[PDB]
Design a protein around this ligand. Structure first.
Ligand SMILES: CC(C)CN(C[C@@H](O)[C@H](Cc1ccccc1)NC(=O)O[C@H]1CO[C@H]2OCC[C@H]21)S(=O)(=O)c1ccc(N)cc1
Lengths: 99, 99
């Protein structure tokens, strides 16, 4: 689909059997989601936004279904104010900016 | 143009007679730039994201040329680690997500 940016580009995602809404964020290198439980072993990391940094838990090779499109990749879990789909997963569903 | 997201969507902008590179950020509601001089009056504001908040100076009706696309709108000036073109200006140049 083609999403215009008059409203936030919010889409529905399915991850770990749960439904959520996430923000298609071209400004985010990595996908970051609010607190939740996920499989596999995770390792610490720190990511920086506009107001500093937060501590997240990095999960690799995690399946996400973004508005119907499936993708497997890194997912960061931490105290983000918004669920964010970063470029690490946007490239997999073949998303592009166009103007 | 069509911009893929394998690399950060950095583009060339032209504001206040200066040349810079900015991040086409669909996750950003409004445009935020690093410190610089701009014309006219401004008002204090605070914007929040991953990590917390920063104090910015809001300039209204500021001319920017994004990849050769002219736009006039709100421009926030503050300690952002990256120059961010937010949705407030992406809409004016006809930017859309497509997958
Ligand atoms: C976090 C979003 C809900 C909103 N943000 C835009 C977002 O693209 C930021 C904007 C951004 C871009 C680069 C550097 C700092 C902030 N990027 C970001 O947080 O990504 C982080 C998670 O993955 C990593 O990728 C880069 C930073 C990490 S924001 O910076 O806080 C913001 C909020 C409001 C306005 N008007 C302008 C910008």
């Amino acid at each position: 689909p083609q999403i215009t940016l008059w409203k936030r580009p919010l889409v529905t995602i399915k991850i770990g059997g749960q439904l959520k809404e996430a923000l298609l964020d071209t400004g985010a290198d990595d996908t970051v989601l609010e607190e939740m439980n996920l499989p596999g072993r995770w390792k610490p990391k720190m990511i920086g936004g506009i107001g500093g940094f937060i501590k997240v838990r990095q999960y690799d090779q995690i399946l996400i279904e973004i508005c119907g499109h499936k993708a497997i990749g890194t997912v960061l879990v931490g105290p983000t104010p918004v669920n964010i789909i970063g470029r690490n997963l946007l490239t997999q569903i073949g998303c592009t900016l166009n103007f």
